[PDB]
Amino acid sequence: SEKDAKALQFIEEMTRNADSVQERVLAEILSRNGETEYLKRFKLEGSTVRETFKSKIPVIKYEDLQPEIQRIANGDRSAILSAHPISEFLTSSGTSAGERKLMPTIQEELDRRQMLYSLLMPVMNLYVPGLDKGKGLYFLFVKSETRTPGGLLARPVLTSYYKSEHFKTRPYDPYNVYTSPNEAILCADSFQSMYTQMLCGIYERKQVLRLGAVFASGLLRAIRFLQLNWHQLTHDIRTGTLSPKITDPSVRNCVAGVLKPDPELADLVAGECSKDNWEGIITRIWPNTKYLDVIVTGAMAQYIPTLDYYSGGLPLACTMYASSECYFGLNLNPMSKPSEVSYTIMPNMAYFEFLPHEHSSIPLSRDSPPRLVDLAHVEVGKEYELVITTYAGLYRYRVGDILRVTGFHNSAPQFHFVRRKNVLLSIDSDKTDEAELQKAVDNASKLLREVNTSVVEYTSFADTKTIPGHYVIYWELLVKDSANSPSDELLGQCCLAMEESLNSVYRQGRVADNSIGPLEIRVVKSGTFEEVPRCVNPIMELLDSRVVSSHFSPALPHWTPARR
């Protein structure tokens, strides 16, 4: 098609001209934002070229920018980071001091995100044909918002995007017709949103040509939801009535097109769900599904076998590489094997620099900043920390992502995603690091003072046998008086104290949308460790063989949308 051709040509043009496009993007940023408080701090003297930018503007982490960001949060509306007003903060799933990081954005950034989204289907159509003959079943969700003292909205980037006009009144695309109505996606009640997205997907089962969600965990949560709610769902289809549990009238209305008594379909679906073996169930309920559109690169790799199990070995497409700070780029070959996925950073999105991995763990100098390596000049096989300069006022901002160059498409590098720095445990969007986990152990261990017990040793892993997944922590204890050992009731309170100690995103996954299961402490017999922490990353079976008792957190930890 003509629209696809234009989009592919855009890729070619951006990729052939990577270095000059990068140059222009920076010049635009520096021309517009030249007068900002932050830039004028480093005597840029109006210069809009790479070389003075590199030698004067420090390379920073989130903490470095907090003075400027807090002032904006607290209502200072002057040109501090951007010439344009900061339209809102996009809350990263990555945290600082336990709280989601506030990433500044501006209004026109939405156009760039939309631009990147518009490239995905033209690329996909090359590899998978006939996607216009049907629909996608995607499970997409908004998350809660809050406002900063100065009145700025603070919410996840996906929420900001789903609730924007670029999504709600998105351009028509016959290769991108979703089963889920906007009102389901936009519904603030996760149960109702999931419920109706599933119902619509079941009603339109035969038109379904792909299943998806942003993350692998999201799609698994959907499959588990069906496992747990197919009784009510099938009753609804049979009767052509919508469960009273759906109280949001706007959501009640969006389902009206499909809600028709269909006993045949209700019997087919219950026929499949009542089986105790769910291997391949995806292609029995949705028999025309060609692939699963779900991120399985990075931390989500852990989910590939569970996905293959339910899908019967269907291809997995990882489409996009993006963040709260900046949408990065796309996968020019969506049909490649998960372990061989490369992402091509799109040079129109921001100004991208790279810090060689081997230099990334030593403090950088503010008065003499490193040159870094430009997007066009990275070397195949080398590893880098991603560094960004955005239109919204992030200047030489270290994302924390390690990337490995695997090749080039024209002049644009392609990147294998290695990892987000210092992330030990993750189930869904939660990212828990060594320090948070350590302080979490210390907190729960003090609760053991009611006996003579202390924690001699610990390790962890993210357990994905269960949906939702959960953190498992292995505890070697030291009980001075065997007669006064700690009980199941107390060790459960040790679990909940650990959870209480973890970051906002963890606690939210427990509370808001059921995307993280209860944290589990496994008490190992004395002396187990000797034969390395604080995480396992087989080996767990060896540890499990020595497990005396296992304890699950009994209640939900504290979480509200409000920030500290």
Ligand X SMILES: Nc1ncnc2c1ncn2[C@@H]1O[C@@H](OP(=O)(O)OCCc2c[nH]c3ccccc23)[C@H](O)[C@H]1O
Q: Which of 117, 203 has the CB closer to ligand X?
A: 117
Burial 38-72 (b: 16+ CB within 10 A, else e): bbeebebeeebebebbbebbbbbebeebeebbebb
Q: Would you call 252 helix, strand, or coil by DSSP?
A: helix
Q: How far is the CB of 56 from ligand X (least distance, A)?
A: 26
Torsions phi, psi for 563 (to 5 deg): -95, 160
Q: How far is the CB of 418 from ligand X (least distance, A)?
A: 9
- DSSP string computed for 473-496: EEEEEEES-GGGPPPHHHHHHHHH
Interatomic CA distance for residues 277 and 231, integer angstroms? 17
| Residues near ligand X (CB under 6 A) | 92-93, 157-158, 214, 295, 297-298, 318, 320-324, 399, 401, 417, 420, 429
Q: How far is the CB of 487 from ligand X (least distance, A)?
A: 39
Q: How far is the CB of 222 from ligand X (least distance, A)?
A: 17
- DSSP string computed for 268-328: HHHHHHTSS--TTTHHHHSTT--EEEEE-SGGGGGGHHHHHHHHTS--EE--EEE-SS-EE
Angle between helices 190-203 and 263-273 (to 10 degrees): 110
- DSSP string computed for 17-76: THHHHHHHHHHHHHHHSTTSHHHHTTT-TT--SHHHHHHHSPPB-HHHHHHHHHHHHTT-
Q: How far is the CB of 324 from ligand X (least distance, A)?
A: 3
Q: Among residues 263, 330, 289, 317, which one has the least CA distance to residue 115?
A: 330
Q: Among residues 364, 358, 322, which one has the least CA distance to residue 64?
A: 364
**Could you give the C-alpha distances from 74 to 38, 151, 434, in angstroms and in order?**
17, 8, 31
Given a contact cutoff of 8 angstroms between Cβ atoms, the answer to whether 413 and 345 are in contact is yes
Q: Which of 30, 157 has the CB closer to ligand X?
A: 157
Q: Which of 388, 543 has the CB closer to ligand X?
A: 388
Q: How far is the CB of 420 from ligand X (least distance, A)?
A: 4
Given a contact cutoff of 8 angstroms between Cβ atoms, the answer to whether 137 and 180 are in contact is yes
Q: Which of 92, 176 has the CB closer to ligand X?
A: 92
Q: Which of 86, 320 has the CB closer to ligand X?
A: 320
Q: Among residues 162, 288, 177, 145, which one has the least CA distance to residue 214?
A: 162
Q: Which of 230, 321 has the CB closer to ligand X?
A: 321
Q: Would you call 397 helix, strand, or coil by DSSP?
A: strand
Q: Which of 117, 395 has the CB closer to ligand X?
A: 117
Residue nearest ligand X, CB atom distance: 298
Q: How far is the CB of 25 from ligand X (least distance, A)?
A: 19
Q: How far is the CB of 505 from ligand X (least distance, A)?
A: 9
Q: How far is the CB of 81 from ligand X (least distance, A)?
A: 18
Contacts of 513 (CB under 8 A, 6+ apart): 141, 143, 190
Residue with tokens 């960001």: 69
β-partners of residue 404 are 383, 416
DSSP code for 183 = H
Cα 67–68–69 angle (5° rounding)?
A: 95
Q: Which of 183, 401 has the CB closer to ligand X?
A: 401
- DSSP string computed for 164-177: SHHHHTPPP-TT--
Q: Which of 92, 289 has the CB closer to ligand X?
A: 92
Q: How far is the CB of 191 from ligand X (least distance, A)?
A: 23
Q: Which of 159, 493 has the CB closer to ligand X?
A: 159
Q: Which of 195, 291 has the CB closer to ligand X?
A: 291
Q: Which of 193, 323 has the CB closer to ligand X?
A: 323
Q: How far is the CB of 151 from ligand X (least distance, A)?
A: 23
Q: Among residues 103, 104, 58, 98, which one has the least CA distance to residue 85?
A: 104
Q: How far is the CB of 403 from ligand X (least distance, A)?
A: 10
The first and second tokens of residue 1, run together, are 């098609």
Contacts of 360 (CB under 8 A, 6+ apart): 385, 402, 421
Q: Which of 420, 551 has the CB closer to ligand X?
A: 420
Report the number of secondary-structure helices (H) and strands (E) in the chain.
Answer: 19, 20
Q: Which of 401, 463 has the CB closer to ligand X?
A: 401
Given a contact cutoff of 8 angstroms between Cβ atoms, the answer to whether 314 and 282 are in contact is yes
Contacts of 107 (CB under 8 A, 6+ apart): 84, 85, 87
Q: Which of 50, 101 has the CB closer to ligand X?
A: 101
Q: How far is the CB of 467 from ligand X (least distance, A)?
A: 20
Q: How far is the CB of 136 from ligand X (least distance, A)?
A: 15
Total residue length of the chain: 564
Q: How far is the CB of 407 from ligand X (least distance, A)?
A: 17
Given a contact cutoff of 8 angstroms between Cβ atoms, the answer to whether 324 and 156 are in contact is yes
